[PDB]
Symmetry: C3
């Protein structure tokens, strides 16, 4: 089961890479080329992640369960680019962009510690990582969105759908984590891999398509 969803991730991310790489080469202006290139590297990093996991790399058992710690290494490089998708479309100020990238880097490193620590202590770092995620939720839902609507007042719903889809998908990750083997262990290890794979595909390929649709709406 797990090996199948890892290979589904490889091909989906790799095929996602080809499309965005083709769009970056044939982009009619620089604004389209940057967004195409951003989503291209996002899918390229994710393809390398799933190829590594599919080949049995980047996994050392913690607490008797298979733990793909390599996710946090590639998420660390791919998730800031997904935030750059948002800040580039909204023409967000660099200070807010830096707070988003810093909170995201903090969320991931502390989420890594929760994954590879003993079962009782793990929940402290989970709470820490969730608190850092709550900062991102606030930053994206309030100051980022209002700034973006104020610059593009004829396309407020475009940014609203963008932030909603982005935050619904990101919110699903700590839900899978807390219920998977490294949390309360309510379901299997194979279902956790499938969840993250479905989520990764949506938040990178699916969201990448949405970002292009948003840029066209911005005209």
């Amino acid at each position: 089961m797990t090996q199948a969803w890892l290979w589904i991730g490889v091909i989906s991310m790799a095929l996602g890479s080809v499309f965005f790489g083709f769009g970056a080469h044939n982009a009619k202006n620089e604004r389209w080329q940057i967004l195409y290139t951003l989503n291209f590297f996002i899918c390229l990093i994710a393809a390398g992640l799933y190829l590594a996991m599919a080949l049995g790399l980047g996994v050392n058992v913690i607490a008797g369960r298979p733990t793909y710690w390599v996710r946090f290494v590639t998420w660390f490089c791919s998730t800031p680019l997904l935030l750059l998708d948002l800040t580039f479309l909204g023409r967000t100020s660099l200070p807010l962009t830096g707070s988003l990238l810093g909170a995201n880097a903090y969320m991931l490193v502390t989420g890594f510690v929760a994954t590879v620590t003993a079962k009782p202590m793990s929940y402290i770092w989970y709470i820490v990582s969730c608190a850092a995620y709550l900062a991102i939720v606030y930053l994206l839902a309030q100051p980022y969105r209002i700034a973006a609507e104020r610059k593009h007042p004829r396309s407020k719903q475009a940014f609203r759908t963008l932030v909603t889809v982005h935050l619904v998908l990101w919110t699903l990750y700590p839900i899978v984590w807390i219920l998977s083997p490294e949390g309360f262990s309510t379901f299997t290890q194979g279902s956790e891999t499938m969840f993250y794979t479905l989520l990764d595909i949506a938040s990178k390929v699916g969201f990448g398509f949405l970002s292009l649709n948003t840029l066209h709406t911005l005209e």
Copy 2:
């Protein structure tokens, strides 16, 4: 003894995080918000460090002594932000900012190698790391300070006190290192932890308060 000073670091850095996080939310202009946000992440990274050390993480014995190698991982992210405190207040040119961040990154990585190497060879990397620190001392005491005084000629002592306090505190770190177990081993491992904890608190919380006082003097 050591577990106590680790927990002193957790609470002090965490309480330091709350204050700077509150000041960033209620900042009256963007210049105050950036400085508050900078010191907020500085204390947030340091809180995570001490929480990790307090919980027995990020430490593998080298040469028979307890070695918290996790310090170098978090210093690598927190110390460049402390340099950004200086360059932001002085409106330092980006090339000088890059040399400061590069010399600082070099000092820390080579200082890491000295910490986790055999006893004789360790002193080569210590000398290397100290040489990289001497570059920072020169960069901050001469070109940074003169550039800052030239832009703020009515507040030259503000930058002078700022650089002096910053460099006195940073200079104390290699002194503790060379006399601690990983150096000539003149005192215990508990006193080393207390030294770094006192120093970390001063150079992050204490220096963070000083940076705000300096910005007010700049008006």
Copy 3:
């Protein structure tokens, strides 16, 4: 044999560091200081690499062969600076600079995986890493070079020689890799070290001299 070429690398890179560090201190304008400082850190990172390897650090046997994995750690910081040499001389746009640094970071991480993986699977990551290198070759030979010639139309051969020398040297690295023990293992481990050392010296010290010669031609 190998210990000799490691020490040749230490002294050559260190002596290379002194020269570029002296040129950065006595630079007559800021454009010369930036280029001198860039090549200074390039040789400083490389000196630390060879000092680490000469001292028996950063090497864990993979597949029965001595594998200096520390190369990829220092290449990761030194090779983007060598690309910054090119983009700074050409006044390259930041988006193209970002694609070059991203493709380079991707080439190195996947090349690292090929080095530390089982013998059959290694060639997949080698092909991946070579594909990322081919992107760099295209980026440097077409959009970077044409943009640079268009801004400096009286010095087109300067950039042409620069890109040619840079790409000839970088191309020699995957050739050494595929024929060394971690590839088809046609020659020894000592010859691999000598190859990389000769190549590193050329692409950092030798190329550093070339970059200064190019800047003078640009006047």
